């Protein structure tokens, strides 16, 4: 079943694991990641978007990161599992 | 002339391209874009971020973007050409 997306999943799915592929197609470190997607992401915001409201989607972006950014399952499930 | 940026920028600018190439390859809308970025961001902080400095990294880039992102541009000249 959806995860809990309800936009579409095989679409951002395909989208991922091309974009992914084009990135490791040339192998380059998170730092060297970051540096690329932190300028596309910008400059993507700084002209796909309207120059007033970009500075606020900026900020929910930001928001919407630290909400997606978690680390692992908070719950300690309680699943037998021996090595 | 050169740039500040040249940090890998033959292959930042070649991969951002090819990114971009890829959206409008899919005809993927902005929206859709940021959707597939930020879980893709997302995923590649849990995956090769360390968890002891996940935060450290989600702060700092959102630093950078809120520091790129502000009033469009700072020095404007005259410019003898209106349209």
Redesign the interface.
Known sequence: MPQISR??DE??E???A???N??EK?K?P?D???????????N???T??A?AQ??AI??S??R???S?????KAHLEHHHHHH
């Open positions: 936009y579409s679409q951002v395909q989208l991922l091309e974009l992914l084009v990135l040339h380059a998170t060297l990641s970051l540096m690329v997607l932190g300028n596309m992401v910008t993507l915001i700084n796909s978007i120059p970009r500075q900026a900020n972006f930001a919407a990161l630290q997606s950014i978690n680390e692992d």
